[PDB]
Design a protein around this ligand. Structure first.
Ligand code: HEC
Length: 116
């Protein structure tokens, strides 16, 4: 995907999220309302350190759910619904009170590029 467009598009992502360098330097000085996305790619979702997740997203992760580029790209288009679906649960609420039926694709590539 267009990692460059992903980077630009990240202007929205960072409203809640951020991206951190391996050493801890706050590269994307965004918010920390959502789990800092650096290294989301391949991660077992709800398990990033120092982040107050919910039961749903954590359980999804615990069920052996890993964030692929595809999954990430899809998620942003239908968060909450994604959880509800894959967890086969009704009460699978998400903190992400935001959706976007675009960006996901390029942003996923950007995240994949960023995990260095
Ligand atoms: C503010 C509201 C936003 C915006 C604009 C975006 N996200 Fe995203 N996000 C947000 C919260 C509060 C949470 C936590 C969910 C929970 O219930 O705990 C999330 C979570 C994610 C995740 C999950 C990652 C993980 O499991 O560790 C992904 C993936 C994710 N959000 C990605 C993402 C992208 C690519 C965005 C770009 C526009 C984006 N979010 C925006 C809150 C918010």
């Amino acid at each position: 995907g267009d990692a460059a467009k992903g980077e630009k598009e990240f202007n929205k992502c960072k409203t809640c999220h951020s991206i951190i360098a391996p050493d801890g330097t706050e590269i994307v000085k965004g918010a920390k309302t959502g789990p800092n996305l650096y290294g989301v790619v391949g991660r077992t979702a709800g398990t990033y350190p120092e982040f107050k997740y919910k039961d749903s997203i954590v359980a999804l992760g615990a069920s052996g759910f890993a964030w692929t580029e595809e999954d990430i790209a899809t998620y942003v288009k239908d968060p909450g619904a994604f959880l509800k679906e894959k967890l086969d649960d009704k009460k699978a609420k998400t903190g992400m009170a935001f959706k976007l039926a675009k960006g996901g694709e390029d942003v996923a590539a950007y995240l994949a590029s960023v995990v260095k």
